[PDB]
Amino acid sequence: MSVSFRDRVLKLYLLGFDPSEIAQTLSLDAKRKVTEEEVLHVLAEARELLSALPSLEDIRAEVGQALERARIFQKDLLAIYQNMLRNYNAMMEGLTEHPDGTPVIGVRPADIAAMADRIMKIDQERITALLNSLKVL
Amino acid sequence: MSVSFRDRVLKLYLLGFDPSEIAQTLSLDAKRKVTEEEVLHVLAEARELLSALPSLEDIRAEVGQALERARIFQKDLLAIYQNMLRNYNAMMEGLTEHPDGTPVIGVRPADIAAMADRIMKIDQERITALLNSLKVL
Amino acid sequence: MSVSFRDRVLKLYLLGFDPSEIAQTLSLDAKRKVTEEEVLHVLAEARELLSALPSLEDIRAEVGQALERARIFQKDLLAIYQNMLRNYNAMMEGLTEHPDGTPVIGVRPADIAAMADRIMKIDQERITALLNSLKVL
Amino acid sequence: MSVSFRDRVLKLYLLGFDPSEIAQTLSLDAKRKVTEEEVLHVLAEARELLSALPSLEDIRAEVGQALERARIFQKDLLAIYQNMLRNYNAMMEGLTEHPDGTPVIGVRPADIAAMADRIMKIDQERITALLNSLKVL
Amino acid sequence: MSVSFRDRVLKLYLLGFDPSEIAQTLSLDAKRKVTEEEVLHVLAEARELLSALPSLEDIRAEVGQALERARIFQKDLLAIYQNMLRNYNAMMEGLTEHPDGTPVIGVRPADIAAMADRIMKIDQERITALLNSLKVL
Amino acid sequence: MSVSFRDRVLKLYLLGFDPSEIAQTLSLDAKRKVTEEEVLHVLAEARELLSALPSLEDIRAEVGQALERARIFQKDLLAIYQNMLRNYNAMMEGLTEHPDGTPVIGVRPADIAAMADRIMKIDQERITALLNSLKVL
Amino acid sequence: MSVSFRDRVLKLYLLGFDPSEIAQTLSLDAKRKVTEEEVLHVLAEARELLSALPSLEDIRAEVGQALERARIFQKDLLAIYQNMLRNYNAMMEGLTEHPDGTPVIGVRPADIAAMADRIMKIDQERITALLNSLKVL
Amino acid sequence: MSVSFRDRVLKLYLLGFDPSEIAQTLSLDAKRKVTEEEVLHVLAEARELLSALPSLEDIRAEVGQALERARIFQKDLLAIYQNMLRNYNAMMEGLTEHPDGTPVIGVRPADIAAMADRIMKIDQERITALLNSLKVL
Amino acid sequence: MSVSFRDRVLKLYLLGFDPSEIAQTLSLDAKRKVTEEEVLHVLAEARELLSALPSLEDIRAEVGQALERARIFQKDLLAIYQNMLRNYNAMMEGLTEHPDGTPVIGVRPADIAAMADRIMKIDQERITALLNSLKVL
């Protein structure tokens, strides 16, 4: 009723189950039975936990993490963009397969422009959010 | 006429039934019959319940819950994004199936960029709403 | 000419019937005949009923009801989202049917991101409208 | 030349007929013939009728009627939404027909989210327009 | 060179004919020939007619007529909307034809929501334009 | 080198021909040959003609003509809209042909709403531009 | 190294060739060879030519030319619009060919509304840009 | 626990693994086992690393790099645009293959206008971001 | 380690290779081997090169070049627009081929309006950017 129960009742409530069903699914989890009031006590308890206010350094944690979310995605998209631009040249020469024998998938030229715009969008998002971190905080 | 009746008459009204039909569907629910005035008394009664004003800590409850709605969805989408990026590499190599024998589903490169944008949208929504929670409240 | 007539003449007028046709459809409803002036008197009468101004607590009634419209819809969409995310995992494993024998319907990964965005849109609408209820009223 | 003629000449002009054709179509309506100047006199006459200014209570008439237009449409869409959500559950179970024998029509989950957004759009339109009625008027 | 010539030369010019072709098409209309200078004199003459400024009551004429354009269109769309909502119920019951024997045309539920939004758009346009007529004029 | 040459060199330049090609196409037009400097002198000459500033009554000429462009187009679209709404009723009754024997072309109900919106857009453009003509000028 | 070389090196650079390739393509153009420094000297030279500032009458040249670009395009589109509206009437009558024997191409009514909107967009662009020419300059 | 471990635990956490799974995947990486507290200590440690604030010269690093991201992409798109405009001319002449024997791929004229707009979008992004670098910094 | 190495390490880094792979690809380029610290020294060195600030005349260089990018593209699109408008007239007459024997490609009338809008967009971009060059600089 401390860690893996207070987490589970909160997570199962936010996916839209009434506290009757939250009890019945957890009635067979570990215990013999879980009463509805046992569920409903935790939901009101965890409500006030979530009702707290952040700190100024607490906000700096996500803005640190959100920009690092971006850099992981740019390592993925630039790997795609190079490997998509590979298929555009090999399609143009008429090669049905790459020299590695791997198949050549068709890529339109307006599709490469889409992935170019996605990358520079992310790179522009770093500059804007980092500047607001300096400005607001 | 206290809990499972006042809830039901309100929920059935907001789905757009006239109080005649709300009576007739609940005429066979528990009682022998439910009069229309018995229904219409509750709807005017629960109208003033809903007409109340929130509190400042009451608003902090949803903003706590709305950001926690986000974190449950990011645990889902990042699980998709990894398992979608798995299918992109295995399609490129020409593997009809994964080494686990599971089939390989085709994924366009502009589709991965869509799921990348959905995730960083949610992550940006946490920063904006949490800052307004500090600013307004 | 009190309840089920003044309602009917107003509702039939706003669906775009001239008062001649409003008379003729209601000429065979209950009475032997309904004159056009009998119809047109009620429309001018109910015009001034609708021309009234609301009260400040009257506006609080809909804002109470509009947010409760949202919570009924989130109970529906989250039930879909869980049962749509069920079909995505079972499609990935290659199961043509669920272990319950029910068929597996194909779900694209960009479709799950659509239902994720609809839910958090509604949840953000509660925060904005409830805050304006505190601010304006 | 009083009621059913001044209405007809105005309505036929605004559908884009020159006053020659307005005469000729009404030349065979009731009279032996209708001269063009007989038509053109009425159009200049009814021009100044339409050129009048509204009153403040006159504007309150439509704002009363426009919100009542909304409530008639919500009685229709919520009837659709329930009867569309019926088809989604019965499609999921694999029932080709309903237990009433009626056919089951396919509904995508992103389509239910469309009708959910249409309803709460209308409900939000009531709050905005009613508040402006209190604010401006 | 007064009415049906000054109108024709202006209308034919604004559809993008050079004054040579305006002459030649009207060279065979009524006269033996029409010189280019005869055309070009009228175009410069009617230019200054169009170059005039409106009056304040002149603007009130169109705003009267523009709102009456709306009411003619709402009489059409509401006639469609009722007769489209007829086909939705009869499609749902499985009736290939109406009880009148007329065929049943398929209507998607998101299509009814489109016509609902068009109507309330027009009704909202009356309130905005009529209020500006009171405000500006 | 006065009228039909200074017009032609300007029009052919703005369609993107270098002055070499402007010379060569006009080298065979009338003269034996046209030198490049003969072309390039006119382009610099007509450059300063276009570089002039308008007058206040000069701007009133187009605003007169632009609104008259609108009225010609509304005479066309309203002729379409009536003749499109003819095909919608005759399709609904099941008539493969009109009583004139002309074929019946299929019209969706959302298409009629498109032409309704185009017309009232144009009618709203007259009110806005005419008011700015009174306001600015 | 004066006219047809300084133009060519600038035009070939802005299409994205490194100065090595600009040399090699022009190595076989006229001369025996063109060194890279011969290319790179011109690019730095023409850089400062482009780095100059305009004059106030210089800006009036393009605004003169940009509006004249519009009038050439309206002579084209109005020629299309008349010849597209020809095909709409002849399709409606059922004529597979025109009386000239030319084929009849199918035109939807929403397509004519597109070309109507393009023309009045251009005509509105003349009024806005010409007024700014009076206002700014 | 210094470089290739603190990087890996952070990168694997931001892809949405709970610290139990981060331990188990790295339990077989190098060590015999990695405890959950060993993982969770690093995540709280690296949280404060990311929680730091940037410097003013630190922001100048990305704005330098973001504009250099643009120039690499323009070297790619201009190479496409020339080699796409090659296929448009050769398609127009009717050449199924290029004179090099390479196949001719079909290009619509509205597609070339898309790549033209992408390039000048990027070129306009350099001017805006570089000016803000002068303005803000 | 001066020109073709500092350029290559920077360009290969911005395409998203870790400095290990930047070393290994350049380990076989010219030298026997390239250490990772040899790579990582240059990346930190070139970081401060990119971290510099522009000059006011430096910004005038791109704005000169960006407008000249436009004029090269208008020479291309106007060449397309004339040669697309050629195919529209020849399709209308029914000519399967041009008098030159070249094939006639089908062009919709709404497609010509697209290329008309692209050109006047570019021409409007010259006026706006050149005016800001006078205004800001």
SS (H, E, C) I45-104: HHHHHHCCCCCHHHHHHHHHHHHHHHHHHHHHHHHHHHHHHHHHHHHHHCCCECCCCCEC
Contact status of I50 with chain A (Cβ, < 8 Å):
no
Cα separation, E109 vs G86, in Å, equals 36
Query: Which of helix, strand or coil describes residue F105?
Result: coil
Q: Which residues pair with A97 in a beta bridge?
A: A103
The answer to whether A104 touches H105, Cβ cutoff 8 Å, is: no
Helix axes F56-93, G109-136, angle to 10 degrees: 160
Cβ of A66 within 8 Å of Cβ of B124? The answer is: yes
**Residue A67, C-beta contacts closer than 8 angstroms, at least 6 positions apart:** A126, A129, A130
Phi, psi (rounded to 5 degrees) for H103 = -70, 155
∠ CA D107-D111-D113, rounded to 5°: 130
Q: Which two tokens stand for residue D10?
A: 């105005």
Contact status of B82 with chain H (Cβ, < 8 Å):
yes
Q: Biggest alpha carbon distance in chain I?
A: 70
Query: Dihedral of CA H70/H75/H81/H87: which sign?
Result: negative
Q: Which two tokens stand for residue C125?
A: 């609408």
Q: Please tell me the distance in Å from B128's CA to the nearest CA on chain A.
A: 10
Cα separation, C18 vs C6, in Å, equals 16
The answer to whether I59 touches G5, Cβ cutoff 8 Å, is: no
Query: Which of helix, strand or coil describes residue H107?
Result: coil
Cα separation, C49 vs C47, in Å, equals 5
F41, G89, G84: which is closest to I91 by C-alpha? G84
Q: Which residues of H touch A106 (CB under 8 A)?
A: none
D134: enclosing H helix or E strand:
helix D109-136
What is the 3 state secondary structure string of B96-120?
CECCCCCECCCCCHHHHHHHHHHHH
Q: How many residues does chain D have?
A: 137
User: Taking the CB of residue D78, how many other CB atoms lie within 10 A of it?
Assistant: 17
Q: Which residues of F touch E71 (CB under 8 A)?
A: none
Place of tokens 């420094």: G37
Cα separation, E24 vs E34, in Å, equals 7
Q: Which two tokens stand for residue B83?
A: 């398992």
Place of tokens 């003749």: F83
H23, H31, H56: which is closest to H133 by C-alpha? H56
To probe the interface with E, which of C13, C17, C18, C51 has the most E CB atoms within 10 Å?
Answer: C17
Q: Biggest alpha carbon distance in chain C?
A: 70
The answer to whether D20 touches D40, Cβ cutoff 8 Å, is: no
Cα separation, E133 vs D58, in Å, equals 13
B1 class by beta-carbon count within 10 Å (0-12 exposed, 13-18 middle, 19+ buried): exposed
Query: Dihedral of CA F86/F92/F93/F97: which sign?
Result: positive
Helix axes C36-50, C19-27, angle to 10 degrees: 110
F58: which DSSP letter?
A: H
Q: Please tell me the distance in Å from D92's CA to the nearest CA on chain F.
A: 30
To probe the interface with I, which of H56, H77, H89, H112 has the most I CB atoms within 10 Å?
Answer: H112
The answer to whether F70 touches F121, Cβ cutoff 8 Å, is: no
Cβ of C15 within 8 Å of Cβ of E74? The answer is: no
**Residue G117, C-beta contacts closer than 8 angstroms, at least 6 positions apart:** F118
One-letter amino acid identity for F129? Answer: A
For chains D and H, tell me whether 3 or more CB atom pairs sit within 8 A of each other.
no
The answer to whether A66 touches A129, Cβ cutoff 8 Å, is: yes
I68 class by beta-carbon count within 10 Å (0-12 exposed, 13-18 middle, 19+ buried): middle
Q: Which two tokens stand for residue H65?
A: 């790099």
Cα separation, I59 vs G40, in Å, equals 20
Q: Which residues of D touch C66 (CB under 8 A)?
A: 120, 123-124, 126-127
**Residue G115, C-beta contacts closer than 8 angstroms, at least 6 positions apart:** G77, G80, G81, G84, I109, I110, I113
Cβ of G70 within 8 Å of Cβ of I124? The answer is: no
Cα separation, G43 vs G19, in Å, equals 9
G49, G45, G52, G43: which is closest to G10 by C-alpha? G43
User: Taking the CB of residue A81, how many other CB atoms lie within 10 A of it?
Assistant: 22
B71 class by beta-carbon count within 10 Å (0-12 exposed, 13-18 middle, 19+ buried): middle
The answer to whether F119 touches E69, Cβ cutoff 8 Å, is: yes
I121: enclosing H helix or E strand:
helix I109-136
Place of tokens 């346009």: E125
For H66-77, b/e burial (b = at least 16 CB within 10 A) is bbbbbeebbebb
Cα separation, C111 vs D84, in Å, equals 19
G100: which DSSP letter?
A: T
User: Taking the CB of residue B77, how many other CB atoms lie within 10 A of it?
Assistant: 20
Q: Which two tokens stand for residue F83?
A: 């003749």
Where does chain C break, by residue before each gap (C–N > 2.5 Å)? none
Cα separation, I108 vs B77, in Å, equals 42
Dihedral angle at the C-alpha atoms of F115, F121, F125, F126, nearest 10 degrees? 60
Residue-by-residue DSSP string for C1-51: --STTHHHHHHHHHTT--HHHHHHHHHTTTSS---HHHHHHHHHHHHHHHT
Cα separation, D74 vs E113, in Å, equals 10
E35, E49, E53, E46: which is closest to E13 by C-alpha? E46
Q: Which two tokens stand for residue F22?
A: 């402007």
Q: Which two tokens stand for residue E124?
A: 């909202």
Query: Which of helix, strand or coil describes residue F97?
Result: strand
B52, A77, B77, F66: which is closest to C113 by C-alpha? B77
Cα separation, F38 vs F13, in Å, equals 14
Phi, psi (rounded to 5 degrees) for F104 = -105, 120
Cα separation, A107 vs A91, in Å, equals 8
Phi, psi (rounded to 5 degrees) for C120 = -70, -15
Cα separation, C114 vs D130, in Å, equals 32
User: Taking the CB of residue F52, how many other CB atoms lie within 10 A of it?
Assistant: 11
Cα separation, E86 vs E84, in Å, equals 5
**Residue B100, C-beta contacts closer than 8 angstroms, at least 6 positions apart:** none
CA–CA distances in Å: residue E67 to residues A99, E131, F11, G135: 69, 12, 43, 34
Cα separation, E119 vs D125, in Å, equals 13
Cα separation, F86 vs C23, in Å, equals 27
Q: Which two tokens stand for residue D75?
A: 């009685």
One-letter amino acid identity for H120? Answer: M
**Residue B51, C-beta contacts closer than 8 angstroms, at least 6 positions apart:** C57, C60, C61, C64
Cα separation, C9 vs H64, in Å, equals 71
Tell me the helix, strand and coil percentages in chain G, rounded to 5.
70, 0, 25
**Residue A70, C-beta contacts closer than 8 angstroms, at least 6 positions apart:** A122, A125, A126, B120
I40 class by beta-carbon count within 10 Å (0-12 exposed, 13-18 middle, 19+ buried): middle
Cα separation, A6 vs A46, in Å, equals 8
CA–CA distances in Å: residue C59 to residues B56, C56, D127, D128, E114: 20, 5, 7, 10, 27
Give the distance from CA H4 to its chain's centroid: 23
Q: Which two tokens stand for residue G65?
A: 């030319």
Cα separation, F61 vs F63, in Å, equals 6
Q: Which two tokens stand for residue F29?
A: 């037009």
Cα separation, A18 vs A27, in Å, equals 14
CA–CA distances in Å: residue G86 to residues D9, F69, I106: 30, 19, 18
Cβ of D120 within 8 Å of Cβ of C47? The answer is: no
**Residue B47, C-beta contacts closer than 8 angstroms, at least 6 positions apart:** C61, C64, C65
Q: Which two tokens stand for residue I22?
A: 């930047």
For chains C and E, tell me whether 3 or more CB atom pairs sit within 8 A of each other.
yes
Cα separation, I62 vs I75, in Å, equals 20
Contact status of I16 with chain A (Cβ, < 8 Å):
yes
Cα separation, D114 vs D122, in Å, equals 13
Query: Which of helix, strand or coil describes residue D97?
Result: strand
Q: What is the resolution of this structure in A?
A: 3.8
Q: Which residues pair with I103 in a beta bridge?
A: I97
Cα separation, B126 vs A66, in Å, equals 9
Q: Which two tokens stand for residue E77?
A: 């769309």
Contact status of G84 with chain I (Cβ, < 8 Å):
yes
Q: Which residues of D touch B50 (CB under 8 A)?
A: none
The answer to whether E104 touches F92, Cβ cutoff 8 Å, is: no
List the domain boundaries for chain H.
Answer: 1-137
Cβ of C15 within 8 Å of Cβ of D72? The answer is: yes
**What method was applied to determine this entry?**
cryo-EM
Q: Which two tokens stand for residue H62?
A: 């990305």
**Minimal-distance CA residue of chain G relative to I119:** G69
Q: Biggest alpha carbon distance in chain A?
A: 70
H48: enclosing H helix or E strand:
helix H36-50
Q: Which two tokens stand for residue D62?
A: 């439509």
G74, G86, G58: which is closest to G115 by C-alpha? G74
Query: Which of helix, strand or coil describes residue H12?
Result: helix
Cβ of D15 within 8 Å of Cβ of F82? The answer is: yes
For chains D and G, tell me whether 3 or more CB atom pairs sit within 8 A of each other.
no
Q: Please tell me the distance in Å from D16's CA to the nearest CA on chain C.
A: 22
B110, H104, B94, H84: which is closest to A105 by C-alpha? B94
Rg (C-alpha) for chain I, rounded Å, is: 25
Give the distance from CA E132 to its chain's centroid: 22
Residue-by-residue DSSP string for A62-130: HHHHHHHHHHHHHHHHHHHHHHHHHHHHHHHHT-SB-TTSPBPPP--HHHHHHHHHHHHHHHHHHHHHH
**Residue D77, C-beta contacts closer than 8 angstroms, at least 6 positions apart:** D115, D118, D119, D122, E112, E113, E116
Cα separation, B104 vs D32, in Å, equals 80
CA–CA distances in Å: residue B109 to residues A80, A107, C87, I102: 7, 9, 23, 37
Contact status of E103 with chain F (Cβ, < 8 Å):
yes
Phi, psi (rounded to 5 degrees) for A97 = -125, 155
Q: For A73, how many CA atoms within 13 A lie in the half-sphere containing its CB? A: 28
Cα separation, B127 vs A129, in Å, equals 10
Q: Which residue blocks in chain B are alpha helix, DSSP H? A: 6-14, 19-27, 36-50, 56-93, 109-136
